[PDB]
Amino acid sequence: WTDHLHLRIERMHWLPRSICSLPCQPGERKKTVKGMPCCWHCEPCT
Amino acid sequence: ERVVGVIGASGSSVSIMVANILRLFKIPQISYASTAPDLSDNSRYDFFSRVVPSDTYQAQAMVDIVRALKWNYVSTVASEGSYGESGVEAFIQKSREDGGVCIAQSVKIPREPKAGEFDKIIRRLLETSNARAVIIFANEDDIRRVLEAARRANQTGHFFWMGSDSWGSKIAPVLHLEEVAEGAVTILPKRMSVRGFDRYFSSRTLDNNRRNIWFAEFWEDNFHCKKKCTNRERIGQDSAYEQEGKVQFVIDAVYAMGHALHAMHRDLCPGRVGLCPRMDPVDGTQLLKYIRNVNFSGIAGNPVTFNENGDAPGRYDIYQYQLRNDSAEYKVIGSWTDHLHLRIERMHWLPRSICSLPCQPGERKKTVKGMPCCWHCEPCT
Amino acid sequence: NSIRIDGDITLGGLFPVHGRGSEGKPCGELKKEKGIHRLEAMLFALDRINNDPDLLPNITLGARILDTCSRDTHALEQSLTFVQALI
């Protein structure tokens, strides 16, 4: 890090997933969130 | 000329660097407004026997207040320095331990405002309209600017400001009237108007005392002159002054120090009426112990006691600032020594800062989240 | 004690030789990995500076290192000793 990130993903050994609310890839549920853009809640509308 | 004891400063951040330095030279320090709990430990500042209770009692009183007011979604705003950080940390800890009053957002006020920073606080608070009541732990300098910024936001009555120890029964922080600070809650330790101090102040002029070098600019600020002003003007019936809430604590601290010195002269020195040679090199530990072992009645009759940590027993009063259409003044509303005694009937000339309105009277269920303050409505089929 | 050697220029030093002690004692377990390595680094740098003719010729640099114990009070006391020695 020299004011420009040079991270090497090929040398990462533990890919990790630290996400509050799992995303909805098919997009069949409404994306509702609280008063903070932190969790993408999926609501299965009718 | 040698100082046996020094009265501690008001600011907790200032008091920390005062007390750690003075601990090296072994001189006890007694404060009147530094109530930060991080100075109450008898391992980092031993020479800090203060005559005011810590901020843990203030946090307990605040959480009791919001519990009695049915408030569960309260925002937190703190300025830089130890006092605000310790106060908000104690408030968060005491609210998390019991009552379930979580914190929506934590806002920080830097020591070096850049104009644009203060109006950032107001629009960061406005991003969560559910959080109405806001806890303020800053001093008057940041409080006035926060109130001014909120006034320009055209959000009168939306925020239920809560006053900290530094926002007690004072005129300067509430100089914005009720245009943006209508009915603001306030907590202050158990003060009492000093008749002797009032009599002393009633006989003070510009040329009366030459010791107070700051009195010249004090008079200049009171009446703008060097618009020339006369020397015969009286400040008693022309400035509408009001003594500060902590001056009684200053007098109490001075009385306690004098009592400790009298006890030292009675015990260590012989029955003479002068300073014995043994008392000329005053020992810091002995004087600190004597201060901790004082017992006398104050001007208001309240007992003065010192514990192992050098903190006064918990005693607080809760007031509210609002206009009664006749005269805007502070009135004793609630008392707090060990349990809340707030008077509901004398509040808001009763609103609740609920995170979410009730979902349904059995029509739909309510769920919780990481913070158990908001009842998320969920329609059962 | 501490590390005090004679020199034309006396440089002060605070190093966390000991860890953060509990309430029983101000100084806890000595940090051999942390404190001693930095102590030896400063000593080696001072020796190299003294032995370097290009940097401060005919001038030696003293050592004024005292223990910190990873405690604010202990470090402030050591700085008090520093300022007392200076005055």
Side-chain angles (χ1 to χ4, degrees), chain A residues 1-16 18-21 23-24 26-27 31 35 37-39 41-42 44-45, chain B residues 1-25 27-111 113 115-119 121-129 131-147 149-153 155-174 176 180-181 183-191 193-209 211-225 227-231 233-266 268-271 273-282 284-288 290-307 309-314 316-323 327-328 330 332-344 346-351 353-359 361-362 365-370 372-381, chain C residues 1-22 24 26-30 33-87:
Chain A
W1 195 90
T2 54
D3 215 29
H4 181 253
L5 183 53
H6 293 97
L7 207 49
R8 301 261 289 278
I9 324 291
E10 73 266 17
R11 317 195 262 182
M12 311 295 268
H13 186 227
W14 302 76
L15 213 53
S18 52
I19 294 303
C20 166
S21 287
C24 279
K31 194 165 89 64
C38 182
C39 309
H41 186 204
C42 277
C45 66
Chain B
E1 61 175 1
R2 182 179 62 70
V3 304
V4 294
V6 52
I7 307 300
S10 48
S12 307
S13 85
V14 153
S15 180
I16 274 156
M17 305 193 5
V18 165
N20 52 46
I21 282 303
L22 299 185
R23 190 200 86 260
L24 318 176
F25 306 93
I27 59 200
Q29 157 185 356
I30 311 182
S31 190
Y32 42 72
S34 289
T35 63
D38 53 278
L39 291 80
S40 284
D41 46 354
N42 225 327
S43 67
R44 203 156 200 277
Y45 317 103
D46 321 87
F47 294 108
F48 193 63
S49 64
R50 57 159 165 230
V51 80
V52 283
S54 170
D55 263 12
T56 73
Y57 304 108
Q58 307 198 7
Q60 189 53 47
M62 285 200 185
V63 301
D64 288 334
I65 279 295
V66 278
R67 280 176 226 171
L69 256 49
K70 270 77 68 178
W71 287 0
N72 51 1
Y73 211 58
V74 285
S75 168
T76 292
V77 167
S79 61
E80 286 308 318
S82 178
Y83 165 60
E85 299 316 280
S86 66
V88 302
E89 164 202 18
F91 180 69
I92 290 183
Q93 286 159 334
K94 299 265 209 183
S95 86
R96 271 174 34 79
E97 285 184 351
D98 48 336
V101 186
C102 59
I103 298 311
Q105 299 205 330
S106 296
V107 202
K108 297 295 304 303
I109 331 171
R111 280 169 182 170
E117 218 291 321
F118 266 82
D119 53 308
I121 282 173
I122 190 61
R123 107 187 54 78
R124 278 230 293 135
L125 288 193
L126 273 187
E127 84 187 0
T128 57
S129 300
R132 273 166 86 80
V134 172
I135 313 297
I136 301 294
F137 264 91
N139 41 71
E140 309 90 342
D141 193 339
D142 319 61
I143 278 165
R144 263 193 50 91
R145 305 189 264 199
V146 156
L147 263 52
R151 212 150 56 168
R152 311 177 277 203
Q155 293 269 337
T156 285
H158 176 226
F159 290 114
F160 302 153
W161 313 93
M162 191 145 278
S164 42
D165 192 11
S166 188
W167 196 1
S169 194
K170 300 174 178 66
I171 299 329
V174 306
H176 285 57
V180 77
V185 200
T186 287
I187 184 177
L188 204 50
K190 209 159 296 282
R191 68 175 263 189
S193 180
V194 194
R195 313 320 200 81
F197 171 70
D198 276 338
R199 285 184 253 107
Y200 181 86
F201 227 73
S202 311
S203 58
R204 300 268 80 74
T205 70
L206 199 32
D207 312 303
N208 200 357
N209 42 357
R211 42 178 186 180
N212 202 320
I213 185 68
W214 299 289
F215 212 70
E217 73 253 36
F218 166 69
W219 209 285
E220 285 178 5
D221 178 312
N222 200 0
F223 319 100
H224 313 272
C225 66
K227 312 184 303 299
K228 195 53 78 180
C229 70
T230 63
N231 293 333
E233 58 197 352
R234 182 78 212 98
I235 70 177
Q237 289 87 16
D238 196 27
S239 314
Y241 88 130
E242 216 194 347
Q243 71 176 247
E244 207 249 325
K246 306 280 223 316
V247 305
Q248 184 251 353
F249 294 126
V250 184
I251 310 205
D252 174 358
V254 173
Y255 253 49
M257 191 95 88
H259 271 282
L261 294 184
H262 187 59
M264 268 187 97
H265 188 277
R266 187 201 297 118
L268 164 156
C269 285
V273 290
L275 189 73
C276 69
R278 290 184 64 190
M279 210 152 137
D280 179 88
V282 155
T285 312
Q286 212 174 330
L287 179 57
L288 178 74
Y290 269 104
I291 291 170
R292 294 273 170 81
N293 301 139
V294 299
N295 225 337
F296 70 103
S297 296
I299 47 173
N302 43 357
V304 189
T305 52
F306 273 104
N307 56 342
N309 289 319
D311 296 293
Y316 292 93
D317 303 68
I318 300 102
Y319 321 97
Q320 209 198 335
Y321 172 79
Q322 81 279 348
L323 323 177
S327 61
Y330 278 97
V332 188
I333 289 171
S335 175
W336 199 97
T337 63
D338 57 86
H339 55 296
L340 188 56
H341 269 159
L342 176 85
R343 261 55 146 200
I344 308 297
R346 317 202 281 249
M347 311 265 298
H348 277 95
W349 303 278
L350 185 51
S353 73
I354 312 293
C355 175
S356 301
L357 281 90
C359 161
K365 70 180 287 184
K366 49 181 59 50
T367 64
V368 303
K369 285 188 178 179
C373 303
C374 317
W375 318 335
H376 173 57
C377 191
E378 182 75 19
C380 289
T381 194
Chain C
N1 298 120
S2 68
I3 303 168
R4 315 164 205 118
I5 75 172
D6 198 2
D8 311 329
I9 288 169
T10 286
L11 287 180
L14 273 305
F15 291 88
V17 188
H18 291 70
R20 291 186 183 272
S22 66
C27 299
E29 171 46 3
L30 164 142
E33 175 64 80
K34 197 163 154 233
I36 307 299
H37 277 66
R38 292 154 211 243
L39 292 181
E40 294 297 326
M42 162 175 233
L43 289 184
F44 158 72
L46 284 182
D47 294 357
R48 195 146 164 173
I49 283 190
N50 294 336
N51 295 322
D52 203 18
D54 211 337
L55 191 63
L56 282 92
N58 304 90
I59 300 182
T60 173
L61 263 61
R64 200 60 182 168
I65 295 100
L66 326 160
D67 194 4
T68 311
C69 282
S70 297
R71 192 154 295 271
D72 260 338
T73 88
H74 200 89
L76 182 82
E77 291 155 35
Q78 305 307 324
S79 296
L80 155 77
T81 62
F82 273 20
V83 296
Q84 280 178 354
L86 184 131
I87 72 169

